[PDB]
């Protein structure tokens, strides 16, 4: 017919990605209807750049989550090694999260193991620390923020070797103190373990999301 009218847009070439979206050139044809007998041709662009969607998910590689807490310091042949110069062992783990659609696995250790001495509930001589620096104002956004500092009854750690060779063959593994001991100090301000002072924060600005 005389009238020109564009047909539908369509890709020129296959989407140049194997997953997700990509950009491709697209085109359309003046054939809906075809101009004929000198009638006007379709006005406008015959081509454009445009998103193409494969609709196929891309691989997603796994990533480690954060390590969990160390397990209790223990030695497999013994009921309790607390408060003795006996290395035990301890471990913690983490999990590979998010792997999907043939993404890579997480590389590295799933479990971390170390040697340790247990001072869990051990009495130890204590001394009062000097004041810590003031902490953050808490709650940061809630009514009336306050910040704190502390003096702590700090235990004297027993003077064991920091490294030990478990095997006759040479090899000095670190050994780390683990557990909450029971430090002994005379009281300060009526307290045996922590003395704390607090101060309001002043002219607190509001928490507004910049967004």
């Amino acid at each position, epitope marked *: 017919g005389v009238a020109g009218g564009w047909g539908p847009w369509g890709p020129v070439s296959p989407c140049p990605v194997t997953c997700g979206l990509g950009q491709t050139m697209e085109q359309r044809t003046c054939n809906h209807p075809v101009p004929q007998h000198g009638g006007p041709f379709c006005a406008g662009d015959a081509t454009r750049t445009h998103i193409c969607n494969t609709a196929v998910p891309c691989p997603v590689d796994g990533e480690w989550d954060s390590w969990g807490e160390w397990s209790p310091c223990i030695r497999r042949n013994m009921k309790s090694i607390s408060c003795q110069e006996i290395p035990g062992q301890q471990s913690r783990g983490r999990t590979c999260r998010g792997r999907k659609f*043939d993404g890579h*696995r997480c*590389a590295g250790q799933q479990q971390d193991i170390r040697h340790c001495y247990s001072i869990q509930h051990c009495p130890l001589k204590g001394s009062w620390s000097e004041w810590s620096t003031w902490g953050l104002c808490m709650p940061p956004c809630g009514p009336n923020p306050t910040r704190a500092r502390q003096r702590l009854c700090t235990p004297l750690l027993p003077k064991y070797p920091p490294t030990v060779s478990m095997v006759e063959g040479q090899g000095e593994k670190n050994v780390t103190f683990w557990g909450r001991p029971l430090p002994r100090c005379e009281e300060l301000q009526g307290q045996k373990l922590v003395v704390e002072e607090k101060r309001p924060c002043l002219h607190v600005p509001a928490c507004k999301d910049p967004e």
Partner: nanobody
Amino acid sequence: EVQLLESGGGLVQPGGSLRLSCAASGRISSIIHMAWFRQAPGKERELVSEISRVGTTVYADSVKGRFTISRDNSKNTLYLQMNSLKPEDTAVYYCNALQYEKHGGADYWGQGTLVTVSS
């Protein structure tokens, strides 16, 4: 099924190098990733390095820059080139191949080869 056969383990001094090889056979077209794992004394087996069919790789932080994984498709072999070896790399090392999920998702394993690094 895919069968894997590793070789190349041995005893080396710190700072030395060794190359592990693994020949793959069977339905190798079903494999998306090939990898090396290792099992050190006292420890669970861990992934050291892996390489996808398209060529992307991942390495454990403890071996990054020191170990290099690679494939020779013309020989259907996978390699782990280890340089700057340290005593803590001592372990049995295992070749592994993982299928695409669309082909069943199976892991396949070699028999293991021992790498010992000692002064």
